Design an enzyme around this catalytic site. Structure first.
Site, PDB file in Angstrom:
ATOM      1  N   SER A  13       0.800  -1.226   0.000  1.00 53.43           N
ATOM      2  CA  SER A  13       0.000   0.000   0.000  1.00 53.43           C
ATOM      3  C   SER A  13       0.837   1.283   0.000  1.00 53.43           C
ATOM      4  O   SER A  13       0.310   2.367  -0.260  1.00 53.43           O
ATOM      5  CB  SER A  13      -0.970   0.001   1.195  1.00 53.43           C
ATOM      6  OG  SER A  13      -0.315  -0.377   2.402  1.00 53.43           O
ATOM      7  N   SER A  14       2.135   1.158   0.284  1.00 51.07           N
ATOM      8  CA  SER A  14       3.034   2.318   0.396  1.00 51.07           C
ATOM      9  C   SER A  14       4.510   1.909   0.483  1.00 51.07           C
ATOM     10  O   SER A  14       4.836   0.800   0.912  1.00 51.07           O
ATOM     11  CB  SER A  14       2.633   3.181   1.607  1.00 51.07           C
ATOM     12  OG  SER A  14       3.743   3.804   2.231  1.00 51.07           O
ATOM     13  N   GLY A  15       5.393   2.814   0.070  1.00 50.55           N
ATOM     14  CA  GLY A  15       6.832   2.611   0.200  1.00 50.55           C
ATOM     15  C   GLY A  15       7.484   3.750   0.957  1.00 50.55           C
ATOM     16  O   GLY A  15       7.008   4.884   0.905  1.00 50.55           O
ATOM     17  N   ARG A  16       8.572   3.456   1.666  1.00 52.99           N
ATOM     18  CA  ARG A  16       9.267   4.483   2.444  1.00 52.99           C
ATOM     19  C   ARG A  16      10.786   4.335   2.437  1.00 52.99           C
ATOM     20  O   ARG A  16      11.319   3.225   2.466  1.00 52.99           O
ATOM     21  CB  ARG A  16       8.718   4.558   3.882  1.00 52.99           C
ATOM     22  CG  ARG A  16       9.017   3.342   4.765  1.00 52.99           C
ATOM     23  CD  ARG A  16       7.758   2.820   5.472  1.00 52.99           C
ATOM     24  NE  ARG A  16       6.997   1.914   4.608  1.00 52.99           N
ATOM     25  CZ  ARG A  16       5.951   1.189   5.001  1.00 52.99           C
ATOM     26  NH1 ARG A  16       5.515   1.244   6.257  1.00 52.99           N
ATOM     27  NH2 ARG A  16       5.336   0.399   4.130  1.00 52.99           N
ATOM     28  N   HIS A 235      12.246 -10.073   3.989  1.00 55.66           N
ATOM     29  CA  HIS A 235      10.797 -10.205   4.054  1.00 55.66           C
ATOM     30  C   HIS A 235      10.291  -9.209   5.087  1.00 55.66           C
ATOM     31  O   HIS A 235      10.708  -9.264   6.247  1.00 55.66           O
ATOM     32  CB  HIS A 235      10.405 -11.637   4.445  1.00 55.66           C
ATOM     33  CG  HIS A 235       8.926 -11.873   4.494  1.00 55.66           C
ATOM     34  ND1 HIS A 235       8.344 -12.761   5.375  1.00 55.66           N
ATOM     35  CD2 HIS A 235       7.909 -11.336   3.776  1.00 55.66           C
ATOM     36  CE1 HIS A 235       7.035 -12.768   5.188  1.00 55.66           C
ATOM     37  NE2 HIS A 235       6.746 -11.911   4.226  1.00 55.66           N
ATOM     38  N   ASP A 236       9.415  -8.291   4.671  1.00 58.33           N
ATOM     39  CA  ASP A 236       8.925  -7.236   5.574  1.00 58.33           C
ATOM     40  C   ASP A 236       8.454  -7.776   6.929  1.00 58.33           C
ATOM     41  O   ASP A 236       8.743  -7.199   7.977  1.00 58.33           O
ATOM     42  CB  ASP A 236       7.873  -6.321   4.909  1.00 58.33           C
ATOM     43  CG  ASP A 236       6.638  -7.071   4.384  1.00 58.33           C
ATOM     44  OD1 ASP A 236       6.538  -8.310   4.514  1.00 58.33           O
ATOM     45  OD2 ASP A 236       5.752  -6.390   3.820  1.00 58.33           O
ATOM     46  N   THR A 237       7.755  -8.903   6.894  1.00 58.23           N
ATOM     47  CA  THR A 237       7.228  -9.526   8.098  1.00 58.23           C
ATOM     48  C   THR A 237       8.360 -10.051   8.987  1.00 58.23           C
ATOM     49  O   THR A 237       8.296  -9.926  10.205  1.00 58.23           O
ATOM     50  CB  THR A 237       6.214 -10.628   7.741  1.00 58.23           C
ATOM     51  OG1 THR A 237       5.159 -10.050   6.967  1.00 58.23           O
ATOM     52  CG2 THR A 237       5.627 -11.269   8.994  1.00 58.23           C
ATOM     53  N   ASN A 295      -1.310 -16.268   7.993  1.00 55.90           N
ATOM     54  CA  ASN A 295      -1.808 -15.087   7.294  1.00 55.90           C
ATOM     55  C   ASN A 295      -3.284 -14.827   7.600  1.00 55.90           C
ATOM     56  O   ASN A 295      -4.119 -15.739   7.552  1.00 55.90           O
ATOM     57  CB  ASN A 295      -1.606 -15.212   5.779  1.00 55.90           C
ATOM     58  CG  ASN A 295      -0.198 -14.833   5.338  1.00 55.90           C
ATOM     59  OD1 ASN A 295       0.787 -15.141   6.009  1.00 55.90           O
ATOM     60  ND2 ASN A 295      -0.101 -14.158   4.198  1.00 55.90           N
TER      61      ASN A 295
HETATM   62  N1  LIG Z   1      -3.599   7.016  11.898  1.00 55.09           N
HETATM   63  C1  LIG Z   1      -4.007   5.734  11.740  1.00 55.09           C
HETATM   64  N2  LIG Z   1      -4.936   5.192  12.557  1.00 55.09           N
HETATM   65  C2  LIG Z   1      -5.354   3.917  12.422  1.00 55.09           C
HETATM   66  N3  LIG Z   1      -4.891   3.087  11.470  1.00 55.09           N
HETATM   67  C3  LIG Z   1      -3.955   3.501  10.580  1.00 55.09           C
HETATM   68  C4  LIG Z   1      -3.451   4.882  10.666  1.00 55.09           C
HETATM   69  N4  LIG Z   1      -2.535   5.026   9.686  1.00 55.09           N
HETATM   70  C5  LIG Z   1      -2.462   3.840   9.025  1.00 55.09           C
HETATM   71  N5  LIG Z   1      -3.305   2.933   9.561  1.00 55.09           N
HETATM   72  C6  LIG Z   1      -3.495   1.541   9.095  1.00 55.09           C
HETATM   73  O1  LIG Z   1      -2.243   0.984   8.707  1.00 55.09           O
HETATM   74  C7  LIG Z   1      -2.378   0.300   7.461  1.00 55.09           C
HETATM   75  C8  LIG Z   1      -1.054   0.340   6.707  1.00 55.09           C
HETATM   76  O2  LIG Z   1      -0.042  -0.163   7.576  1.00 55.09           O
HETATM   77  P1  LIG Z   1       1.395  -0.652   7.036  1.00 55.09           P
HETATM   78  O3  LIG Z   1       2.081  -1.420   8.148  1.00 55.09           O
HETATM   79  O4  LIG Z   1       2.113   0.533   6.436  1.00 55.09           O
HETATM   80  O5  LIG Z   1       0.957  -1.703   5.893  1.00 55.09           O
HETATM   81  P2  LIG Z   1       1.823  -2.169   4.617  1.00 55.09           P
HETATM   82  O6  LIG Z   1       3.259  -2.360   5.043  1.00 55.09           O
HETATM   83  O7  LIG Z   1       1.107  -3.439   4.231  1.00 55.09           O
HETATM   84  O8  LIG Z   1       1.667  -1.019   3.642  1.00 55.09           O
HETATM   85  C9  LIG Z   1      -3.525   0.999   6.744  1.00 55.09           C
HETATM   86  O9  LIG Z   1      -4.304   0.075   5.990  1.00 55.09           O
HETATM   87  C10 LIG Z   1      -4.379   1.559   7.859  1.00 55.09           C
HETATM   88  O10 LIG Z   1      -5.518   0.728   8.088  1.00 55.09           O
HETATM   89  O1  LIG Z   2       3.683 -11.566   0.091  1.00 56.64           O
HETATM   90  C1  LIG Z   2       2.305 -11.477   0.467  1.00 56.64           C
HETATM   91  C2  LIG Z   2       2.167 -11.212   1.988  1.00 56.64           C
HETATM   92  O2  LIG Z   2       2.686  -9.872   2.284  1.00 56.64           O
HETATM   93  C3  LIG Z   2       3.409  -9.944   3.525  1.00 56.64           C
HETATM   94  O3  LIG Z   2       4.799  -9.941   3.230  1.00 56.64           O
HETATM   95  C4  LIG Z   2       3.074  -8.763   4.439  1.00 56.64           C
HETATM   96  O4  LIG Z   2       3.182  -7.533   3.717  1.00 56.64           O
HETATM   97  C5  LIG Z   2       2.998 -11.284   4.151  1.00 56.64           C
HETATM   98  O5  LIG Z   2       3.992 -11.731   5.077  1.00 56.64           O
HETATM   99  C6  LIG Z   2       2.971 -12.147   2.899  1.00 56.64           C
HETATM  100  O6  LIG Z   2       2.255 -13.357   3.123  1.00 56.64           O
END
Ligand SMILES: Nc1ncnc2c1ncn2[C@@H]1O[C@H](COP(=O)(O)OP(=O)(O)O)[C@@H](O)[C@H]1O
Ligand SMILES: OC[C@@H]1O[C@@](O)(CO)[C@H](O)[C@H]1O
Length: 479
Positions: A13-16, A235-237, A295
């Site tokens: 959903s996003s990169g940093r 792996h992010d997780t 998962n």
């Molecule tokens: N201020 C906030 N309050 C509550 N939930 C939040 C907030 N900001 C982000 N989130 C939740 O965090 C999720 C994204 O988290 P993140 O760990 O960055 O996911 P990923 O690594 O999969 O992109 C969003 O879907 C949202 O539901």
């Molecule tokens: O790769 C798809 C899914 O994405 C994650 O890495 C989390 O962002 C989970 O660990 C993996 O099962």
């Protein structure tokens, strides 16, 4: 004497691009965000894909911001979502499209594998949960549907190693992420012959998986100086678990983002009948500590409801959802129907309507449905994991962006009947930084790092409420 380490953390959903500052004597760890950018699914030529070129440019942007700042960078490290991969030819040019795990090309192939190779067998070899989008079935899809690409392919790199290669020129196959593929044999820590054979992939496309800590190569700021690029728990997780301030053996983690990954750490995998029946995974971790988890579809459902309903204020939505009665709309988020439906709101409502339940129609109702259904599954999985290892959990550590959802944090505490510790928010980033520091000899191990985190990060405690609505509900479903 303070070290400046850069984490590149790419999610679905996003990169940093983030910078961390650390020194041993002070035991202080500060995180700075350098470049935040959007990531998402792009529909490209009948496929659901990742825009890897835009991400690399975004990554380079972030890194060039640190160099032009005149900061001495001691290391760089990259973590991303698991499973996915990029194919390369003899020269390094990409072959085919960078297809996402949310693509339907794999539909049915998991069932075919369990039929052809045996459910028990694949599980005994890999110790990895059956997910329809595993690399094992992604590579089958490619070899079956596009056999004209095969001759061109020289190398297959998983996403974080792909981006590490783009910076260094050196190819790596990082262990913790390699395990997400369901192609690594759990007893040898190397690629399984029979699984590779069924996928149609070639063993020469991959090198022996290497455990986190090695220097892949170096990256060059526009002026010259070499910065070592470290293979982290890519792996992010795996990175998020490293950064979770786990208090010994009876602590569980919930890595909460797009996916909710719930599990614990073990030095030995669980591949018995109980683990197979519960569909538990034994993903690779730092120090050989298996991440024994499941998962859970996660906040992906909320993400989709947000876009479709045109909601730009998430905290406002959460605040309103808190005013709504709990557990009137319940779905199973892990149902395949939620992986990538066209209409998420309609899917959720259809699922509710099928169970003769009232239909969630308002924004708050759809969020209520999602938060409640996740919390019940959190409860289910936690019981499944404790029952497997034959030991209770004293505390649950919720990390990731999802850990800012104070409603869901409390719901999870109340449903699981367990103390919840929320934080750190950017766990994957921190774990990425954590490995770099060990490679720099600034840090001794993961337990060392988790003590830094637990005395650095903001940690919010959620006490399980026995007289809660969801607690009332969960006790009712026992008898
Ligand atoms: N201020 C906030 N309050 C509550 N939930 C939040 C907030 N900001 C982000 N989130 C939740 O965090 C999720 C994204 O988290 P993140 O760990 O960055 O996911 P990923 O690594 O999969 O992109 C969003 O879907 C949202 O539901
Ligand atoms: O790769 C798809 C899914 O994405 C994650 O890495 C989390 O962002 C989970 O660990 C993996 O099962």
């Amino acid at each position: 004497t303070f070290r400046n380490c850069v984490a590149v953390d790419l999610g679905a959903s996003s990169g940093r691009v983030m910078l961390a500052r650390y020194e041993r004597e002070c035991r202080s760890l500060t995180l700075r965000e350098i470049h935040r950018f959007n990531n998402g699914l792009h529909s490209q030529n009948g496929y659901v894909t990742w825009d890897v070129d835009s991400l690399e440019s975004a990554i380079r942007l972030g890194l060039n911001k640190v160099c032009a700042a005149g900061i001495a960078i001691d290391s760089i490290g990259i973590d991303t979502w698991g499973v996915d991969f990029v194919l390369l030819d003899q020269q390094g040019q990409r072959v085919g499209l960078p297809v996402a795990y949310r693509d339907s090309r794999t539909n049915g192939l998991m069932a075919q594998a369990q039929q052809q190779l045996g459910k028990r067998d694949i599980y005994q070899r890999s110790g990895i949960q059956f997910l329809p989008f595993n690399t094992l079935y992604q590579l089958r899809a490619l070899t079956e549907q596009q056999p004209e690409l095969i001759p061109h392919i020289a190398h297959a790199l998983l996403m974080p190693d792909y981006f590490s290669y783009r910076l260094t020129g050196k190819m790596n196959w990082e262990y913790t992420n390699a395990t997400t593929t369901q192609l690594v044999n759990i007893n040898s820590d190397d690629w399984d012959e029979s699984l590779l054979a069924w996928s149609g992939a070639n063993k020469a496309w991959f090198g022996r998986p290497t455990h986190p800590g090695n220097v892949i190569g170096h990256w060059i700021c526009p002026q010259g100086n070499e910065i070592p690029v470290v293979a982290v728990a890519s792996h992010d997780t795996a990175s998020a678990v490293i950064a979770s301030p786990l208090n010994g053996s009876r602590a569980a983690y919930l890595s909460s983002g797009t996916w909710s990954l719930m599990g614990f750490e073990s030095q030995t995998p669980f591949t018995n009948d109980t683990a197979l029946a519960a569909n538990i995974t034994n993903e690779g971790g730092a120090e050989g500590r298996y991440r024994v988890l499941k998962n859970i579809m996660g906040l992906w459902l909320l993400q989709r409801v947000l876009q479709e309903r045109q909601i730009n204020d998430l905290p406002a939505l959460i605040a309103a959802t808190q005013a709504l009665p709990a557990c009137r709309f319940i779905i199973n988020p892990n149902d395949d129907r939620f992986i990538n439906p066209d209409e998420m709101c309609s899917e959720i409502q259809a699922a509710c309507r099928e169970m003769a339940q009232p239909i969630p129609e308002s924004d708050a109702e759809l969020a209520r449905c999602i938060f409640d259904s996740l919390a019940l599954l959190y409860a289910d999985v936690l019981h499944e994991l404790a029952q497997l290892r034959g030991e209770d959990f004293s505390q649950l550590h919720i990390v990731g962006g999802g850990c800012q959802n104070t409603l869901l944090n409390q719901l999870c505490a109340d449903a699981c009947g367990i103390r919840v510790i929320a934080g750190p928010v950017e766990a994957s980033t921190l774990g990425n930084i954590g490995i770099q520091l060990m490679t720099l000899d600034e840090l001794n191990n993961v337990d060392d790092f988790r003590q830094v985190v637990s005395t650095t990060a903001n940690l919010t405690t959620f006490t399980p409420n026995p007289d809660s609505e969801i607690a009332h509900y969960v006790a009712l479903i026992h008898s």
